[PDB]
Amino acid sequence: AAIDKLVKASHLIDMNDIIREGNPTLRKVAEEVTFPLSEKEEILGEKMMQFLKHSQDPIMAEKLGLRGGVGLAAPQLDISKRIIAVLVPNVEDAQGNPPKEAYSLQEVMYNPKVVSHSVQDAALSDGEGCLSVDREVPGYVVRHARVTIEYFDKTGEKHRLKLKGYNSIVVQHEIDHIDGIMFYDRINEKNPFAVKEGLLILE
Ligand SMILES: [Zn+2]
Ligand SMILES: [Zn+2]
Ligand SMILES: [Zn+2]
Ligand SMILES: [Zn+2]
Ligand SMILES: [Zn+2]
Ligand SMILES: [Zn+2]
Ligand SMILES: [Zn+2]
Ligand SMILES: [Zn+2]
């Protein structure tokens, strides 16, 4: 089955593993994982993080035919489990100095969920994209500005985390996937660029 192919030691995740808009797995509510994790579930998380590392690496992205990304959910690999990986890099300064921290967020999250959020909404100015969606989709994807999430790591340790800005948006977008929600579900149906007063537009 799909998970068996993905977790083979020599197997690298690429675009051929990513299912496409229309595939029913994208619309399911993914199943919670139980702890302790199976070896498959642990390796799957590791492969998913590796895929994001590769997508952000100039050489490996070219070798594998990948395009940059910051998040991946297991349903996108045809695996209906509540597993996501997020990897959001910090950026060099104007002088070309690497940041203090390589990443502002780097986690493989098991059973993640939003436990509370701000009343205020936010949206990326440039909209959102998706590896499973081979269409141009304009518009503000309206999300919570700030969230508090809970999730478990591969060890079963529970974490509780507050997020805002871009990382809030990235997380979620990935949580949506494990609930069978697609980004364009959160775009205004009649005017993609409608702005309800108070919306935080993120640059
Ligand atoms: Zn493959
Ligand atoms: Zn391991
Ligand atoms: Zn590598
Ligand atoms: Zn709680
Ligand atoms: Zn609420
Ligand atoms: Zn996505
Ligand atoms: Zn919500
Ligand atoms: Zn629509």
Residue numbers in the entry: 2 to 204
What does the paper say about this structure?
PDFs are ubiquitous essential metalloenzymes which co-translationally remove the formyl group carried by the initiator methionine in bacteria, mitochondria and chloroplast. Here, we present and characterize a PDF enzyme issued from the bacterium Streptococcus agalactiae (SaPDF) which behaves as an excellent structural platform to describe PDF-inhibitor interactions. Like most other PDFs, SaPDF behaves as a monomer and its crystal structure reveals a classical PDF fold. In addition, SaPDF contains the typical insertions of type 2 PDFs12, including an eight-amino acids loop folded as an α-helix (insertion 2) and a long loop connecting strands β2 and β3 usually referred as the CD-loop (insertion 3).
The apo-protein crystallized in two different crystallization conditions, which gave highly similar structures (root mean square deviation between all Cα is 0.307 Å). According to this measure, both free SaPDF crystallized in a slightly open conformation (δap measured between C131, H178 and V71 is respectively 48.0° and 47.5°). Like other PDFs10, the core of SaPDF is composed of two α-helices, three 310-helices and eight β-strands organized in two β-sheets. The structure is organized into two sub-domains around the active site, called N- and C-terminal sub-domains.
